[PDB]
From a paper:
The model shows that ctp52 is organized into four distinct domains, an N-terminal domain (NTD; aa 1–120), two middle domains (MD1; aa 121–319 and MD2; aa 350–454), and a C-terminal domain (CTD; aa 455–514), that interacts with p8 (40).
In the latter structure a 28 amino acid long linker region of ctp52 (amino acids (aa) 322–349), that is not present in human p52, was replaced by a short linker (sequence SNGNG). A superposition of the ctp52/ctp8 structure with the cryo-EM model of human p52/p8 within [name] shows that the MD2 domain was found to be oriented differently compared to our model. While the antiparallel β-sheet of MD2 (β-strands 8–11) is pointing towards MD1 and is involved in the formation of the dimer interface in our ctp52_121–514/ctp8 structure, it is pointing towards the N-terminal extension (NTE) of [name] in the [name] model. However, after the rearrangement of the individual ctp52 domains according to the model of human p52/p8 embedded in [name] an overall rsmd of 1.6 Å was obtained, indicating a high degree of structural similarity. Our crystal structures of ctp52 show that p52 is a flexible protein that requires its binding partners [name] and p8 to assume a complete functional state. We cannot exclude the possibility that the domain arrangement observed in our crystal structure is a crystallization artefact due to crystal packing.
Residue numbers in the entry: 109 to 165, 176 to 238, 254 to 320, 331 to 435
Amino acid sequence: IPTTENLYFQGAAAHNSFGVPSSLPVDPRIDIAFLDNYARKKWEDILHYVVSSVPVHGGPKASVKDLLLAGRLVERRPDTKTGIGITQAGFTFLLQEANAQVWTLLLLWLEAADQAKAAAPDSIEMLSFLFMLASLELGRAYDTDALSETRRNMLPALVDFGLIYIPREDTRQYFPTRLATTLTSSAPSAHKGSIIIETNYRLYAYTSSPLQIAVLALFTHLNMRFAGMVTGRLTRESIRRAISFGITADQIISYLASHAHEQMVRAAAAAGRPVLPPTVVDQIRLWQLENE
């Protein structure tokens, strides 16, 4: 009998508390354009911290750093200068779209409270607040006074996820970002076509169409993953297979560079380093010249 829309509407109406709009005047400089930039800057920091753990050779709050660590997205390493190392889930997280990344962090946030509850704000209270936020209007100011004490205690973790914006000047108002409004919506991709090349010759990529799967298979040891995702390792055999298809090392390097991950390019450009690892790029050319 009941569909997805029926169960959602039932869970949303289940709790009588809803978003009260602030009767107080709104600062003109807090527009939909500002809130989009704010939410973007919050997530760019989270993503930069994840990109920081990628092997080569001022950060988000403890509320974010710990959830990524406990969520096995980034493992603790006692050898690195940064003291952290990226996992398989970490690279998957990087290729995920904006909405999916928020739900990775949200579901882990819900999981952390129940684990702290079992050892002794619970899941029911947290979910109900997320359900309310999804029904809010983007750009509109809402009364913080109207929120319950438990819901008020959730705001610092929710601002850390770039879902809510509370001005330093007026704590009486809370602004939901585009991430809050569109949270449970859809009832122009961000990382489709991207390729991630590691220092250990490993590949992580989200193919645009099966044409890219066929293209990557010419020079990489592929293995199909969920949706358009593919994973593999660059070997002498795979690189020399490309030679038999008329693909040169120069064409391989130029393809991996042009199709590189947005955030990984950003971190490389901000430092004094090229996107693709130089050690790998030299080995791509060597294998193509290693013939008889």
